[PDB]
Design a protein around this ligand. Structure first.
Ligand SMILES: [Mg+2]
Ligand SMILES: [Mg+2]
Ligand SMILES: [Mg+2]
Ligand SMILES: [Mg+2]
Ligand SMILES: [Mg+2]
Ligand SMILES: [Mg+2]
Ligand SMILES: [Mg+2]
Ligand SMILES: [Mg+2]
Ligand SMILES: [Mg+2]
Ligand SMILES: [Mg+2]
Ligand SMILES: [Mg+2]
Ligand SMILES: [Mg+2]
Ligand SMILES: [Mg+2]
Ligand SMILES: [Mg+2]
Ligand SMILES: [Mg+2]
Ligand SMILES: [Mg+2]
Ligand SMILES: [Mg+2]
Ligand SMILES: [Mg+2]
Ligand SMILES: [Mg+2]
Ligand SMILES: [Mg+2]
Ligand SMILES: [Mg+2]
Ligand SMILES: [Zn+2]
Lengths: 249, 38, 119, 196, 160
RNA sequence: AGGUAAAUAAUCUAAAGGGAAACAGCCCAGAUUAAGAUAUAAAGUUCCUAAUAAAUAAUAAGUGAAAUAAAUAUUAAAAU
RNA sequence: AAUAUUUAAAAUCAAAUAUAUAUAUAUUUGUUAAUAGAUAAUAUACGGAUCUUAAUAAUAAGAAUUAUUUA
RNA sequence: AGAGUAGAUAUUGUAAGCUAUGUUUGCCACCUUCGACUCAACAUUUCCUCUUGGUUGUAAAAGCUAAGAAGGGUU
RNA sequence: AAGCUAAGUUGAUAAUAAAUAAAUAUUGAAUACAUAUUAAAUAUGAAGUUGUUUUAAUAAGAUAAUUAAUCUGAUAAUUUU
């Protein structure tokens, strides 16, 4: 009845011993990490306008981050995925735009075809929100601090003056044909090569930018927007993550 | 501490110790007599 | 000293064994030379080869260089020699007044058994 | 050797046992080694406490006169001989602790230099010239008590642990030479400098 | 004449277990022993032009022997190319990061011949800090060895 | 001084081969053409890399492991 | 145990070889170690890996360092 | 040696001794551009910042001297 | 006016934690004393180290769909985030 198999004595008679835990494991990394105790929500940077404090009279530039159909699609767990995170989805998209596979995924998770999806990593299993629920601006409290991730404005192929604040050469006094140049780019033969990471002209902007400890000036569920003190990376209609500030409480 | 190659005990109250692969001379009476071998 | 003559200051075990073997070979050669002379002298007197080989009283060599080589005070055998004189020459300009024999040029051919009494 | 040869006296209330460990560990030096197998215990009135010890060492319990001896398999082995004098001394200290108890008096010296039991004995608050509050938690086994504010007493079964704790307490402010001023553990002295 | 026949078994990649808890060799000597196996020098059919070396599964690698004070002294180096980026890690640190198996692998890599097959040979080495491993089922075994092993242990292994 | 000036010997010069990591001059040894069984030289024999097993001591410093760094200091060890 | 030198086979003793030979004479050989001192600029740099062993327990490892040797 | 109110070794340290460095001025002869601007990379023999030993010459405060330390900074 | 900009605006100098350096201790022999250990045990300790934080790269893993009247991409057009 049983299948034919041979087993080595060396592997059978080996005394059982558990492996020690390693730093470059997922679970150790998770333990190390500095993470927020609560989920976040995806937003769109609609624009920017003044916020007048009515008690003091102080004016503050505030960016208006709109919150539309923001929904916990699913979430990830340490036993399956190696970490705790809430996959949030923002907005509504047409059928036409969304891939068949993506549409099927959304149907399975029981949400509308979504405009932008993103994870929000958390410390514990307690931080996970039940899936399918709708996240509104009232999630955040007025006066609380939040970290803000988004892709910055694209600046194109930039020079070393704009990239790195290089002083450049003089305007007059003989200076020929190199007024905005980086000057020397190395050393005569000891290196015999431009060493890695030498600040040179290149593409700038259109990279991710976390902005830490920004104050939530105002929250209102009526207009579907979170007011946030100061600037946020990227153009108008750019997607903006928002989670509680790890540094500030 | 007088960090030096030569490390002799000065007074009777000085005592030599061998720690961390270095000869230390501590002293119970005079604190100036503290020495270390390199 | 920009050119690198990477010669170690001391010999390996295998080098030392080879040196010892070489020393032993020169002693053997000397022994053979004396033995053959003795045999020849026995033959001249009127013995057979076998009889000469058997002989109790072996004849010592009359020529000077051979006689000197036979003497251990002048030319010692490998078994007689000190550990130091097998592997270290006398070099007056070196510190310790000593230098590895392997540093001598053509040390594999050139013989040097006897060092000075206190150097 | 001269220490380890000295026999240990025991009173009927105290029992010095010995037995093998559950999982013996081996200390590996450069050339020599040292396998910790046995585990001596000193049970008594005030408490009980143990010493993990090498295989080469073993006791010799005598019924007559309450003596016990300690010996190693090779006294001419240097490491073993060194261990022998240590272990005997350790078990003597344990005996002393379980029967009598080890003590460590700290006297505070200075204007407004004093100790206080803050967490019902579980945290010795120490005020010794600092804006920030200073102190540390008492370990298990250690019992602290304060007859005066400026004179604290630490008490325990382990001579090692109590005196370590005392040293830690002192470390906040050791005695200064100019004014005999700080925290003095037991009979501690300091040569006071001339004022000038 | 000697070469003519069925050569498939000669060039067969066997799988060699080594329970490091049982093995009494030090790290470097063990690594050297492994290297030969990985190359295929042990087998007489070997030729330098052909990779014909076996798999080596190392297990219970946490109990590997290292002499002296090498565990807290011996430094493993690394360098990207950009100056001021020399990464020097002590053996214990490396172990903490990855394991004792990583350490063994490095030794084995250094032992191996420096050419296009080296990487392949290194890959064939399968090291494990503890006991449990997927290749348990594929170590070379014989029917005559089966009496030594108890009945239910074999079944448990098969299940695993 | 990898300096300079000559004395003696060798090699290079004009010398390929093995060793010395790599190497004009050091250690072996001189390519007429092959063959590859046997003796080998200097140098080697854990792996990279052709080839190894022992004995008695010492070191614990990775000292050292083919390019030996000094006076002096400390700690031992023998002998008187 | 303490004090103070020396680190030696010249003397001395022991061992071995050669001449008359159970002895004498002559010759040859045998007398410390570790650490610190220690040190610059592209990058660790014994050529590299790596090398100092461990009972339970292996048909099995235990310098791959230094010194004197053997097969 | 000698200064240091006294005490060579807190701090100082003649002349002579033993080394390291390859930062100066030379020597050799294998080998036939100073400064400014710009951007700097590396070292540590550390000037500042952090930790610490000594300081009859650390009462305090400023110091002096020494050990660790090249993360950040150094008109 | 938009845009772009700094003279402008907003934020950050990335914790907690772990093991350490010099240095400071505990018990304690070897060595009747002494000795923080170049012994066994037990503790403190730095703008440094490990990390943490941030960016870029990579893609283990995960959800879903699976020869298609509208599967997934590309070529094409109108464009700019
Ligand atoms: Mg300008
Ligand atoms: Mg112009
Ligand atoms: Mg010349
Ligand atoms: Mg010519
Ligand atoms: Mg040639
Ligand atoms: Mg010629
Ligand atoms: Mg010829
Ligand atoms: Mg070394
Ligand atoms: Mg070297
Ligand atoms: Mg003599
Ligand atoms: Mg270097
Ligand atoms: Mg080599
Ligand atoms: Mg004077
Ligand atoms: Mg002078
Ligand atoms: Mg002060
Ligand atoms: Mg320094
Ligand atoms: Mg850091
Ligand atoms: Mg600002
Ligand atoms: Mg004592
Ligand atoms: Mg003490
Ligand atoms: Mg810190
Ligand atoms: Zn003193």
């Amino acid at each position: 009845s049983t299948r034919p198999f041979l087993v080595a004595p060396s592997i059978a008679n080996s005394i059982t011993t558990e492996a020690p835990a390693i730093n470059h494991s997922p679970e150790l990394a998770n333990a190390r990490k500095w993470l927020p105790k609560r989920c976040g929500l995806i937003t769109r940077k609609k624009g920017m306008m003044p916020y007048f404090d009515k008690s003091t009279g102080e004016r503050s530039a505030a960016t208006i981050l709109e919150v539309n159909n923001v929904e916990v699609i699913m979430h990830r767990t340490s036993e399956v995925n190696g970490y705790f995170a809430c996959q949030v989805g923002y907005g509504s998209r047409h059928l036409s735009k969304v891939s068949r596979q993506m549409l099927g995924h959304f149907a399975s998770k029981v949400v509308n075809p979504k405009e932008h999806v993103a994870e929000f990593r958390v410390k514990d299993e307690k931080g996970l929100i039940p899936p399918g629920t709708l996240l509104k601006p009232s999630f955040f409290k007025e006066g609380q601090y939040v970290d803000v991730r988004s892709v910055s404005k694209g600046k194109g192929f930039t020079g070393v003056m704009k990239r790195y604040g290089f002083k450049g050469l003089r305007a007059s006094h003989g200076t020929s044909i190199m007024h905005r140049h980086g000057g020397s780019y190395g050393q005569n033969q000891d290196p015999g090569r431009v060493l890695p990471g030498r600040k040179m002209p290149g593409h700038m902007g259109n990279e991710h930018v976390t902005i830490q400890n920004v104050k939530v000036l105002k929250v209102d569920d009526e207009n579907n927007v979170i007011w946030v003190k100061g600037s946020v990376a990227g153009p108008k209609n750019s997607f903006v993550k928002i989670q509680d500030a790890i540094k500030k409480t | 501490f007088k960090v030096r190659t030569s490390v002799k005990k000065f007074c009777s109250d000085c005592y030599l110790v061998r720690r961390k692969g270095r000869v230390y001379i501590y002293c119970k009476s005079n604190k100036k007599h503290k020495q270390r071998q390199g | 000293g920009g050119l690198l003559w990477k010669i170690p200051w001391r010999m390996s075990t295998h080098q030392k064994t080879r040196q010892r073997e070489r020393l032993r070979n020169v002693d053997q050669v000397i022994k053979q030379l004396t033995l053959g002379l003795h045999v020849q002298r026995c033959q001249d007197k009127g013995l057979t080869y076998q009889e000469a080989m058997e002989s109790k009283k072996k004849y010592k060599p009359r020529s000077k260089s051979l006689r000197l080589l036979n003497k251990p005070s002048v030319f010692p055998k490998e078994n007689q020699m000190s550990s130091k004189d097998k592997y270290w020459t006398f070099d007056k300009k070196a510190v310790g007044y000593r230098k590895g024999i392997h540093k001598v040029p053509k040390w594999t051919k050139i013989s040097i058994r006897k060092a000075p009494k206190f150097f | 050797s001269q220490v380890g040869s000295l026999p240990l006296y025991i009173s009927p209330e105290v029992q010095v046992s010995i037995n093998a460990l559950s999982m013996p560990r081996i200390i590996r030096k450069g050339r020599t080694s040292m396998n910790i197998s046995q585990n001596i215990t000193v049970k008594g009135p005030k408490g009980e406490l143990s010493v993990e010890v090498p295989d080469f060492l073993h006791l010799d319990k005598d019924e007559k006169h309450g003596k016990i001896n300690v010996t190693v398999q090779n006294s001419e082995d240097k490491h073993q001989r060194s261990m022998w004098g240590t272990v005997r001394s350790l078990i003597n200290n344990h005996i002393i602790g379980v029967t009598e108890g080890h003590l460590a008096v700290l006297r505070f010296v200075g204007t407004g230099y004093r100790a206080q039991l803050e967490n019902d004995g579980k945290f010795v608050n120490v005020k010794v010239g600092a804006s920030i509050k200073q102190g540390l938690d008492v370990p298990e086994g250690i019992v602290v008590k304060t007859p005066a504010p400026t004179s604290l007493i630490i008490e325990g079964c382990n001579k090692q642990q109590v005196l370590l704790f005392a040293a830690k307490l002192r470390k906040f402010h050791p005695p200064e030479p100019y004014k005999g001023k700080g925290i003095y553990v037991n009979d501690e002295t300091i040569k006071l400098k001339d004022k000038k | 004449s000697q070469k003519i026949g069925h050569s498939g078994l000669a060039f067969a990649r066997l799988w060699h277990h080594v329970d490091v808890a049982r093995d009494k060799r030090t790290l470097g000597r063990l690594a050297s022993a492994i290297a030969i196996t990985l190359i295929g020098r042990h087998k007489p059919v070997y030729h330098p032009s052909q990779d014909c070396g076996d798999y080596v599964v190392v297990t219970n690698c946490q109990k590997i022997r290292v002499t002296g004070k090498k565990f807290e002294q011996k430094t493993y180096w690394s360098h990207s190319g950009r100056p001021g980026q020399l990464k020097l890690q002590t053996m214990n640190k490396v172990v903490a990061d990855k394991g004792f198996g990583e350490i063994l692998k490095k030794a084995v890599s250094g032992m191996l011949p420096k050419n296009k097959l080296r990487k392949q040979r290194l890959d064939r080495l399968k090291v494990f800090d503890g006991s449990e491993n997927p290749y348990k089922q594929n170590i070379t075994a014989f029917a005559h060895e089966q009496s030594s092993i108890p009945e239910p242990l074999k079944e448990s292994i098969f299940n695993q």
